[PDB]
C-alpha cells in the first residue's frame, strides 16, 4: 500500500446527520517483487477416467 495514501476519509451529509467514508487504501502490487505460492503439496491429485 502507499506510505500514507492521499485517498482518505470523506464525509456524507444525511438530512441533518452525517457519516464518514473510511479511508480508501488502494493496494498496489509491485512491478518487480514476488513470492511463490504455498501448497499443501501432499494433496496434489491427478485425474483418470
Amino acid at each position: 500500500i502507499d506510505e500514507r495514501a492521499s485517498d482518505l476519509r470523506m464525509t456524507i451529509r444525511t438530512r441533518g446527520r452525517s457519516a464518514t467514508i473510511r479511508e480508501t487504501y488502494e493496494i498496489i502490487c509491485d512491478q518487480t517483487k514476488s513470492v511463490p505460492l504455498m501448497i499443501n503439496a501432499k494433496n496434489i491429485a491427478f485425474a483418470s477416467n
Binding site: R4, S6, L8, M10, R15, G16, S18, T20
Partner: protein, 948 residues
C-alpha cells in the same frame, strides 16, 4: 421568440443551465402568459370581471383599499411596490404595524427572496396571507402577467432585466390606477437604479429610495430608526468565495459544524467536527473573523506553527490534517483552527440595553450607541440613532444589518420600541422571545379555522339524528357517555382543563375506570393552519403573570375543555383492574360526556380525606388513591426515582404591583391520585399503539445518568459526608439515595434531590422508528415504553398520539405526515425544543418575580453552600432558591490566609467581619445577608448575596 395559442395565449421557452455539483446541466422550460391577471384591488372594476374560481371553487378577495395613506401632492393616494433589496435590508420595517399597509409584491421580487433566504421567504408568505383590514399585501405574478412580461435583451445580464421588469411592473400599475388617482411608489436602494429615472427615462414613475420614501411620511420619526444601515484599528480578513468553498468541501479541505464562543473568554472557541473527536479550538480575534456564537461556519485547520500545547497546495494540508488526528491523540499539543467561511448566520431579532457612555445627554440628534446585549457571549453593536436619550432607560429590539470590513462591531438597526427597564410588563416580554416563546395573538387566517358556533354550541343529544349523521359520518363509533359522573382535580388558576374521570365499581369484584381526554381531533385536521400553529407555537406556557396558549381562547378553554355539565367531545378509555392493580381490559373509543364539577387543588382534598362528602363519585375517588399507591410502589420498585424539587411559586401580594413575597409550591395528596393513572395512559395506550404502529408512534425515552454524573457528588459525599450512591440499578440508586439523609437536617434528603437534578438525562420525545425497544426506556420512571398523553393543550405531542390512535381503533385513516419518519424527526426535536423553550422561561417566571423581591427587602437568613471553590463559595437560600457566589474577598478578608482545599472542598479562612479560623465546608448552615442589585453591565437582576 414566442408563439401564440388560439385562446390569444402566449407560449415561449425560458431555458437555463443548472449549476449543481459544479455540473453544466441545461434546463429548458416552456412558459405561459395569461391575460386573466387580476389587479386585486378595491377600486378597479374590471379585474373583478375576469376572476374565476379555483379547484375549491372560490373567487378571492381584493383587499387593497381605495384609501391608502394619502400624502403630499404629487403623491396623493399611492400604493407601494418594493425592491428585494429594500426588503433584504429592511424586512422588519415591513412588519411595523404603524405603517406600510398596501404593498404589491412582484413575482421576481418574490423569487429573489426565495433565491436568497428560506425563512425570510416564510415571512412574506406569512404576511401576504395574513394581511388584514389594516395592512394588505398581494403578490402580483408579473411574469405570469402578459402585459408586464419582458425578455432578455441582447447583451444583457440577468440583473438588468430584473430592474427593467420591475420598472415595467410599475408601468402597468398607474396606468390601471389612473382612473382612481391612487399612485404607485417604487422603492429602491440602488444608486444606478436611482440614476436612470433622474432623466425620467421612459415612465413618469415614482422612483424614490427608502429614505426618499421615508422622508415623506407623517410619522416618519418613529420608523427611521428601523431604517437599516474611522472605526478601525486593524483590518479583518474576508470569507472565501463560492467556488473556493465548494472546491473545498469535496477534497476534505473544509469542515463545518457549530461553534461555541466562551463568555469567560470572549476570544476563543471550539467546534465539534464530524471527522474529529476532540473540540478543536479557534484562537484569535482575526481567526474568529467577525462571526457570532452559535453560527454555522466553515473552518480550516491551522499549521503546526500555530498549534497549541496545553503552503499553497492542499496537498500539504490534508497530510497535516492527518497530523491533527495524531495531535488529537496526543492531547499534549493539540491543533488550532480558524474559520474561512460562514455556512450560516444564526442571526435573528435581538434585545439588549444601551451604554450610558455611548449617549450624550445634551444632544438631541443622531448618534452612535452600542447595545449591551442580553446575550453575554455576543458583542456590542454600533447604532447610529436619534432618540437615544429616550431609549436608554428603555428596552429595545434591534436587528443586525451587516458586517463590512472596517467595523470592529457590526452595523445593525433598532427595530421595536419595547418599554421601560425593569418594568414588569416589558421584562415579561423579552423573557418570552429571548427564550423563544410565541406570544402574538391569533391572526385573521387563524380565526377562520374555529368551528362556527362560538360559545353557543352543544353536542347533539340525538346521536343518530340524520343531520347530525350528516354532520358526523363517523358518529357510528361515537358513544354516549354523558351518563357518567365526572369530576376533575384542577388548579384554581386554571380554565384549560385536560382531565375528566369517573370510577365505578363492577359487581364482578372490581372497579370500573373511565378517563376522558378532549376530542379536539374532530376539529384540528392536517391541512388546517390552526393545527400548524399547534406545531408552530408547539405548546402553551405557564407563568405566574400569565399563560400564553397554543390554541385560541374560545376553543381550548370552553368547547373542548371538560368543564361541568357542558356537552363536550372527548376520547374515552375504559379500564377494569383488581384490588391488586392488575388491569383486566382496556377499551379505546370516542364519546361525549357530562360532568359534575372541576375541583381546586384544595377542593378535591376537601372531598378526599373529609369522610363526609360520601357519594359514589367520591367512592370512585377513594378507589383511586387506594391503588395509586400500588402504582406508586410498583413504578418505583421497577427501578424508578422520586425527586422532590419545590420550584417555588412567587405569591405576588394581591394588593401591590411588584412581588416582594416568597412562597413555595405545596404538593398534597390529590397530586398522586391523578398522576399515576395519567402515566398509565402514557404506557397502556402506548402499549396499544406500539402494537398498532411500531415504527411511527410518538414515544419519549429517558437514559441513565451514569456514575460520571454522580462521582463528583460522591467525592463530596465521601470526603465530607462519608456516603455515596449505588449506580447499579436506579432502584438501588434510589435506595442508596434514600439512605443519604442526615438526621439533624431531614431536608438533606431533599437537598440532594434538587441537586442531582442538574445531571439527570434529558428525556425527549421521539418516534419509535428511530431506535429499538430497550431504547424506548424511561430510566427515571422505570418503564421500557413511554409517551405523553394526558394534556392536549400544553402538549401537542399528546394530540398527535390521538391521531395515530384514531386508526388504532379504526375511527379514521391515518394522515400521511404522521407516517413519514422524515417529517417525524423534524417534529420530535422541535417539540422537545419548544418544551426546552418552556421551562427555561418557567424558571424565569420565578426569576423576575424573585428579581423584584430582593430589590428592597433584605434579610439575614440561612443560605446553603452548594459549591466551595477557590474564587469563593456559591450560597443558596432554600427558602428562595436563588444562588450567589460570595467571592473570596467578599467572602473573607486576608485571602492569602484563605486556603482552598480541593479534596475536602474547603475554603478555610479568617473572615471579613471577624478573624476566627473559619473552616468553610459544604452543606452546613450559615448566616447570610440577602439583597439584589441588577448588574449594570449585564442587566440581570443578580441576587446580591453576602455572608454574615
Amino acid at each position: 421568440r414566442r408563439k401564440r395559442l388560439a385562446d390569444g395565449l402566449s407560449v415561449t421557452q425560458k431555458v437555463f443551465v443548472r449549476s449543481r455539483n459544479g455540473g453544466a446541466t441545461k434546463i429548458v422550460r416552456e412558459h405561459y402568459l395569461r391575460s386573466d391577471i387580476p389587479c386585486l384591488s378595491r377600486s378597479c372594476t374590471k379585474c373583478p370581471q375576469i376572476v374565476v374560481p379555483d379547484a375549491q371553487n372560490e373567487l378571492p378577495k381584493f383587499i387593497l383599499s381605495d384609501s391608502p395613506l394619502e400624502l403630499s401632492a404629487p403623491i396623493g393616494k399611492h400604493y407601494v411596490v418594493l425592491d428585494t433589496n429594500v426588503v433584504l435590508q429592511a424586512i422588519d420595517l415591513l412588519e411595523n404595524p404603524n405603517c406600510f399597509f398596501d404593498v404589491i409584491v412582484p413575482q421576481i421580487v418574490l423569487d429573489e427572496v426565495r433565491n436568497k433566504s428560506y425563512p425570510v421567504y416564510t415571512r412574506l408568505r406569512t404576511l401576504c396571507r395574513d394581511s388584514d383590514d389594516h395592512k394588505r399585501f398581494i403578490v402580483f405574478h408579473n411574469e405570469f402577467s402578459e402585459h408586464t412580461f419582458v425578455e432578455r435583451l441582447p447583451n444583457e445580464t440577468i440583473n438588468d432585466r430584473n430592474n427593467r421588469a420591475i420598472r415595467k411592473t410599475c408601468q402597468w400599475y398607474s396606468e390601471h390606477l389612473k382612473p382612481y388617482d391612487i399612485n404607485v411608489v417604487l422603492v429602491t436602494n440602488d444608486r444606478l437604479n436611482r440614476e436612470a429615472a433622474t432623466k425620467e427615462v421612459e415612465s413618469n414613475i415614482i422612483t424614490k429610495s427608502l429614505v426618499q420614501y421615508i422622508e415623506l411620511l407623517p410619522n416618519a420619526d418613529d420608523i427611521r430608526d428601523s431604517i437599516p444601515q474611522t472605526f478601525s484599528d486593524f483590518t479583518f480578513p474576508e470569507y472565501y468565495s463560492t467556488a473556493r468553498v465548494m472546491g473545498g468541501l469535496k477534497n476534505g479541505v473544509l469542515y463545518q459544524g457549530n461553534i461555541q464562543i466562551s463568555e469567560y473568554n470572549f476570544l476563543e472557541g471550539s467546534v465539534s467536527l464530524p471527522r474529529f473527536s476532540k473540540p478543536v479550538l479557534i484562537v484569535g480575534q482575526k481567526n474568529l473573523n467577525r462571526a457570532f456564537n452559535g453560527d454555522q461556519v466553515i473552518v480550516e485547520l491551522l499549521p503546526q506553527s500555530e498549534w497549541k500545547a496545553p503552503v499553497i497546495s492542499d496537498k500539504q494540508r490534508r497530510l497535516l490534517a492527518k497530523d491533527a488526528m495524531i495531535a488529537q491523540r496526543s492531547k499534549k499539543i493539540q491543533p488550532t483552527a480558524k474559520v474561512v467561511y460562514i455556512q450560516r448566520r444564526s442571526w435573528r431579532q435581538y434585545v439588549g440595553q444601551l451604554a450610558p457612555s455611548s449617549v450624550d445627554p445634551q444632544s438631541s440628534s443622531t448618534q452612535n450607541v452600542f447595545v449591551i446585549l442580553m446575550d453575554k457571549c455576543l458583542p456590542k453593536v454600533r447604532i447610529r440613532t436619534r432618540r437615544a436619550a429616550e431609549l436608554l432607560d428603555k428596552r429595545i429590539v434591534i436587528s443586525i444589518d451587516s458586517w463590512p470590513t472596517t467595523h470592529k462591531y457590526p452595523l445593525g438597526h433598532f427595530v421595536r420600541d419595547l418599554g421601560t427597564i425593569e418594568s414588569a410588563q416589558a421584562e415579561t416580554e423579552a423573557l418570552l422571545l429571548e427564550h423563544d416563546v410565541e406570544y402574538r395573538p391569533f391572526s385573521k387566517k387563524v380565526l377562520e379555522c374555529l368551528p362556527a358556533e362560538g360559545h353557543d354550541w352543544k353536542a347533539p343529544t340525538k346521536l343518530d339524528d340524520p343531520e347530525a349523521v350528516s354532520k358526523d359520518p363517523l358518529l357510528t363509533k361515537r358513544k354516549d357517555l354523558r351518563d357518567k359522573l365526572i369530576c376533575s382535580i384542577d388548579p384554581p388558576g386554571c380554565v384549560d382543563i385536560n382531565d375528566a374521570l369517573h370510577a365505578k365499581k363492577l359487581p364482578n369484584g372490581n372497579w370500573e375506570v373511565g378517563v376522558h381526554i378532549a376530542d379536539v381531533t374532530h376539529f384540528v385536521k392536517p391541512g388546517t393552519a390552526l393545527d400548524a400553529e399547534g406545531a408552530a407555537r408547539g405548546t402553551s406556557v405557564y407563568l405566574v403573570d400569565k399563560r400564553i396558549d397554543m390554541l385560541p381562547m374560545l376553543l381550548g378553554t370552553d368547547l373542548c375543555s371538560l368543564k361541568p355539565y357542558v356537552d363536550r367531545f372527548a376520547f374515552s378509555v375504559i379500564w377494569e383492574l383488581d384490588d391488586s392493580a392488575n388491569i383486566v381490559n382496556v377499551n379505546f373509543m370516542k364519546s361525549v360526556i357530562r360532568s359534575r364539577e372541576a375541583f381546586s387543588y384544595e377542593q378535591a382534598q376537601l372531598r378526599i380525606d373529609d369522610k363526609t362528602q360520601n357519594d359514589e363519585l367520591t367512592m370512585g375517588m377513594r378507589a383511586l388513591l387506594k391503588l395509586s399507591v400500588k402504582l406508586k410502589q410498583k413504578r418505583l420498585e421497577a427501578g424508578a426515582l422520586n425527586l422532590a424539587s419545590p420550584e417555588v411559586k412567587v405569591h405576588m401580594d394581591s394588593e401591590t404591583s411588584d412581588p416582594n413575597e416568597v412562597e413555595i409550591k405545596k404538593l398534597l395528596a390529590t397530586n398522586s391520585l391523578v398522576e399515576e393513572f395519567m402515566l398509565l395512559a402514557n404506557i397502556s395506550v402506548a402499549r396499544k399503539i406500539y402494537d398498532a404502529f411500531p415504527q411511527t408512534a410518538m414515544l419519549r425515552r429517558h437514559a441513565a445518568p451514569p456514575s460520571t454524573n454522580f462521582e463528583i457528588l460522591n467525592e463530596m459525599l465521601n470526603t465530607r459526608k462519608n456516603m455515596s450512591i449505588s449506580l447499579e440499578s436506579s432502584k438501588a440508586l434510589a435506595d442508596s439515595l434514600d439512605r443519604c439523609v442526615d438526621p439533624e437536617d431531614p431536608y438533606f434528603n431533599t437537598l440532594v434531590r434538587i441537586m442531582s437534578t442538574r445531571c439527570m438525562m434529558a428525556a425527549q420525545y421521539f418516534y419509535s422508528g428511530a431506535y429499538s425497544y430497550p431504547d424506548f426506556r424511561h430510566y427515571g420512571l422505570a418503564v421500557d415504553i413511554y409517551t405523553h398523553f394526558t394534556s392536549p393543550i400544553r402538549r401537542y405531542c399528546d394530540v398527535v398520539a390521538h391521531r395515530q390512535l384514531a386508526g388504532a381503533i379504526g375511527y379514521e385513516p391515518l394522515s400521511l405526515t404522521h407516517r413519514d419518519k422524515n417529517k417525524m424527526d423534524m417534529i420530535c426535536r422541535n417539540i422537545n425544543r419548544k418544551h426546552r423553550n418552556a421551562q427555561f422561561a418557567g424558571r424565569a417566571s420565578i426569576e423576575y418575580y424573585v428579581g423584584q423581591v430582593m430589590r428592597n427587602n433584605e434579610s439575614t437568613e440561612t443560605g446553603y453552600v452548594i459549591k466551595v471553590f477557590n474564587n469563593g463559595i456559591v450560597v443558596l437560600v432554600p427558602k428562595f432558591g436563588v444562588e450567589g457566589l460570595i467571592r473570596l474577598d467578599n467572602l473573607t478578608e486576608d485571602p492569602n490566609s484563605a486556603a482552598f482545599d480541593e479534596v475536602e472542598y474547603k475554603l478555610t479562612f479568617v473572615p471579613t467581619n471577624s478573624d476566627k479560623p473559619r473552616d468553610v465546608y459544604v452543606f452546613d448552615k450559615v448566616e447570610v445577608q440577602v439583597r439584589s442589585v441588577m448588574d449594570p453591565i449585564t442587566s440581570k437582576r443578580k441576587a446580591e448575596l453576602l455572608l454574615k
